[PDB]
Design a protein around this nucleic acid. Structure first.
Lengths: 105, 90, 73, 246, 137
RNA sequence: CACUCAUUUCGUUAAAUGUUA
RNA sequence: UGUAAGUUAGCAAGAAAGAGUAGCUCUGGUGAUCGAAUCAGAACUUUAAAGGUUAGGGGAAUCCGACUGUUUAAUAAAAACAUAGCAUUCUGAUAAAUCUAAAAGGUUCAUUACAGAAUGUGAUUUCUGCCCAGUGCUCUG
RNA sequence: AGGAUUGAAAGGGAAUAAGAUUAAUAGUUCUUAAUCAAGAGAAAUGGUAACAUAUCAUGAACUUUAAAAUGGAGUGUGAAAAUCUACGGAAGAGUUCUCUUUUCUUCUUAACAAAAGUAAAUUCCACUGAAAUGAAUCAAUCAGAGAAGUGGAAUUUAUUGGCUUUGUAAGAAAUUCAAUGAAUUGUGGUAUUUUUGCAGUCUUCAUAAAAAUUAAAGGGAAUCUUUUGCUCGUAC
């Protein structure tokens, strides 16, 4: 087999020193540098991973399109649909209860 | 499989019969499931010492070190409930 | 490098003044029209000789054209 | 002679607390008008494990009484607290588990925890696992109340000293027998450097006052006065009694 | 009937989550294309802003404009309220039928602005108040 | 014995203390 | 294939003890809508087969330490140290211990008796007898 | 507005690859092809929904959320590479008086992007409402706070979007032949190992960093081309 060497001067297998050995022209293999695996967005209430948003590095969200870093809904990109649905029902039902309980019962 | 050394069989023969018997009672309770006080599902499992999380129900409950509710904290809950009634009613 | 897909978009590339150079590579099966623009190198894979000649005529006369064959320049 | 290990512990070089992963300081919120004369509501967002302490900690979020924003707190969780719970702090708070009330509002016999020794000092007593203090009696003549500390001693505090109603979570932690020296080694991961304790008799005369001779023995009485200088105060200090009590 | 024409509802999910809408037609059984219980709702996408005495009349009228939407929504995705409007006052809502909705294409902007204009006119007269206030989640 | 006014130990964004209304 | 006393019932245990193993020619079992090395069996032949390399000697008792771990770099690796278990002492935090010449100084302490600090013995089982005169320590005198 | 300096060439971090080249330097030079940062030239739609639209489709103060950013063990499994191997060959070499349609060697392709064809795992959404209880895993585990089934949405899989394929791009490179010019560069595998993710299980009196910096939300104040990219290390 073909053995390879690090290209940069980092000699230790740290988290930021990940490599991939891929085949090149002529049969020789070159060394790449692979990105770290990143987490996604979580709902602020239930801590569940949000859908519709990619799991990329924080600085790479700026390069994405405007619609690719959020969801077209209230609290989109910070609250899940279950998280939001309870917020709406909490807001309406509590105010309605206050209207009859107090406020000229 | 084993006559009487059920869960402390992982300790082999190296901690004394009584010490293995004392910890056997605690480890059975520590790793068991408990009935969720809010959704009544046998799904509460300890994560850290004093933190009990209810799996299929999404609740985090503070409790005992190795059981969901201690007997000392059970009477305190009933003591405070009785004291609150006396304060509320005269 | 980006690839244009059908015959319409390539013409608008030569019609536009953003062009910088054109290289035509003839392969054993098809011929590629590589338009060197400011940012990218657009290429069109033409498999029809009749439409290849039409694209050759549409090249503005004031731009450099490189014809490549089995031997590179 | 040399300096004993008890003396080297006071300089605090390798004996400093291993408090790097700790959540923070666990205490009540700073006392303001809205808690002296009214009540505030706090949401229990999560319950976490504070390294180095046996009881869980609660991340309570009070909204704000005077400005716009949030007030993120960090309480010592009472047994029975759950995520999403509403707790109330204030003079007019109801007598429920987890609420923080002035000690004078608690009826006699109430079980409280995280009691303040001085009003507004954010909790001193009854903070370890499963620990609590009991209200003994009140005294409206001088605005003072009596409570029973977890050690059994009685203490007289101002009636507006604050405490949380309930038991500190995590009780029964010390009833589980450590079996391995490794488990005891991990217990002090977020604590001080104390664990592997070499007996004084096993040392040399230079190292310890117990450093013996040809036979491992102390040689002199192990009960000492409180006025003994550091470096000789090894053993039992001001021991009223001694031996297996009956 | 809980879901009847003229009833005011609150949308729970979708792009218009938390908006207030008025029911036009009800179909609990569903159709061949619509395999669910649904209602046709006319809602207020953008609630009016508050106005003061300092703002000029052209700014006041602009600030009180109402942005409306017409949408078919599953009956499971709306929470009915106890409020009802008079469908005679909002006559244009009566003509928002199921057949007016074509799946895939944009709703006609002419009908949307015609309802939007009349929504703002009734808000200016102050006849309906709970409909035209933004719900704070 | 009573007080606070030096003094001690604290807490806060010195964020409604005390007396009237 | 078989495996004893003892035992904290988990082990002792690879206990101990015995038989088989090569080459060649075949058969069968284990799948998917052609393929995997694996297992079992049967003929015949020989210099009768793990052994080129690699690769546990075993049993019967006694003493010490319970066990995993650490140690005198350069004559001592242990029965010494640690250990978990047991027990004792002080301390309500402005405290206990304790560094500093001093200090809105420092450490355990981002701590609060299920805690902090000081000690002895050293797992489990069984048991810890009598003595407060002397020297300590203590007293609510 | 909230707290000063320094502290990592293994922690966090905007963005570059292939081929060629030198007596010696090369993610640094050359060729070709890219990327990043900082500059210059009354406010949209679609889907029931999960959510989706080459910038599109305004969004200030203030506040909140998420990311950067989190132990270990063990099991299963997706993909790539290496090794082994099946089919079909092209080119060269080795052995050959004893045979061997034989043994051996080459048959490759980057960053960055595209979107013919097509996956595995997980989480959600719509319809319906499960007991004669079903569904499933190596193990588990799950279900009227709603299973299974049918049809969908999203994300992860060493860059865009995981794999084949495509642009780059064969014009390079590899192996041959002739004396610079010519030839080739399929398709597979329910195999092993390494690497890289994923999914749930277990374990703790252990719960296993922060900041720079980035994005989103709530609120509603106001009304394609082109330029530049400094300092220092870089030999062995």
């Amino acid at each position: 087999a073909v053995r390879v060497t690090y290209v940069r001067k980092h000699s230790y297998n740290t988290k930021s020193n990940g490599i991939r050995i891929v085949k090149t022209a002529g049969g020789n293999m070159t060394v790449q540098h692979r990105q770290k695996i990143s987490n996604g967005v979580r709902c602020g209430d239930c801590g569940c991973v949000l859908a519709g948003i990619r799991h990329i590095r924080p600085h790479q969200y700026g390069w994405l399109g405007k619609s690719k870093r959020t969801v077209t809904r209230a609290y989109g990109g910070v609250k899940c649909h279950k998280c939001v649905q309870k917020k709406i029902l909490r807001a309406f039902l509590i105010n309605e209860h206050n209207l009859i309980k107090l406020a000229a019962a | 499989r084993t006559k009487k050394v059920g869960i402390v069989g992982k300790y082999g023969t190296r901690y004394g019969a009584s010490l293995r018997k004392v910890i056997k009672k605690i480890e059975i309770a520590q790793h068991s499931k408990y009935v969720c006080p809010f959704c009544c599902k046998e799904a509460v499992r300890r994560t850290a010492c004093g933190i009990w999380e209810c799996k299929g129900c999404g609740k985090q409950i503070a409790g005992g070190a190795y059981t969901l509710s201690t007997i000392s904290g059970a009477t305190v809950r009933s003591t405070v409930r009785r004291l609150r009634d006396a304060k509320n009613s005269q | 490098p980006k690839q244009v897909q059908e015959f319409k978009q390539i013409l608008k590339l030569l019609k536009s003044g953003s062009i910088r150079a054109v290289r035509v590579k003839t392969n054993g099966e098809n011929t590629k029209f590589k338009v060197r623009c400011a940012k990218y190198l657009y290429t069109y894979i033409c498999a029809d000789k009749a439409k290849a000649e039409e694209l050759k005529k549409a090249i503005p006369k004031d731009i450099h054209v490189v014809e490549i064959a089995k031997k590179a320049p | 002679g040399r300096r004993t290990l008890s003396q080297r512990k006071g300089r605090g070089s390798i004996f400093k607390s291993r408090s790097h992963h700790k959540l923070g300081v666990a205490q009540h919120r700073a006392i303001d008008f809205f808690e002296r004369h009214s009540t505030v509501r706090g949401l229990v967002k999560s319950i976490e494990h504070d390294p180095g302490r046996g009881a869980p900690l609660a991340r309570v979020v009070f909204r704000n009484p005077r400005q716009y924003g949030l007030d993120k707190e960090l309480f010592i969780c009472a047994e029975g607290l759950y995520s999403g719970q509403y707790i109330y702090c204030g003079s007019k708070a109801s007598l429920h588990i987890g609420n923080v009330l002035p000690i004078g509002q608690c009826p006699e016999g109430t079980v409280v925890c995280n009691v303040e020794s001085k009003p507004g000092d954010r909790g001193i007593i009854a903070r370890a696992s499963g620990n609590y203090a009991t209200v003994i009696s009140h005294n409206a003549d001088n605005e003072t109340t009596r409570i029973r500390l977890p050690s059994g001693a009685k203490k007289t505090l101002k009636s507006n000293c604050r405490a949380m109603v309930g038991i500190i979570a995590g009780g029964g932690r010390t009833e589980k027998p450590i079996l391995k020296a490794g488990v005891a080694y991990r217990m002090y991961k977020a604590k001080r450097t104390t664990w592997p304790r070499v007996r004084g008799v096993a040392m040399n005369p230079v190292d310890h006052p117990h450093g013996g001779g040809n036979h491992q023995h102390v040689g002199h009485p192990t009960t000492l006065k409180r006025s003994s200088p550091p470096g000789q105060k090894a053993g039992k200090v001001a021991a009223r009694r001694t031996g297996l009590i009956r | 009937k809980i879901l009847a024409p003229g009833r005011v509802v609150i949308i729970l999910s979708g792009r218009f989550a938390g908006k207030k809408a008025v029911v036009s037609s009800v179909n609990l059984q569903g159709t061949k294309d619509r395999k669910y219980g649904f209602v046709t709702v006319v809602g207020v996408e953008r609630a009016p802003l508050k106005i003061t005495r300092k703002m000029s009349a052209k700014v006041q009228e602009m600030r009180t404009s109402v942005k409306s939407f017409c949408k078919v929504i599953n009956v499971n995705h709306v929470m009915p309220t106890k409020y009802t409007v008079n469908l005679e006052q909002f006559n244009l809502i009566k003509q928002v039928k199921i057949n007016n909705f074509e799946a895939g294409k944009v709703y006609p902007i002419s009908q949307k602005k015609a309802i939007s204009s009349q929504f703002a006119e009734e808000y200016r007269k102050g006849k309906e108040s709970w409909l035209f206030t933004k719900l704070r989640f």
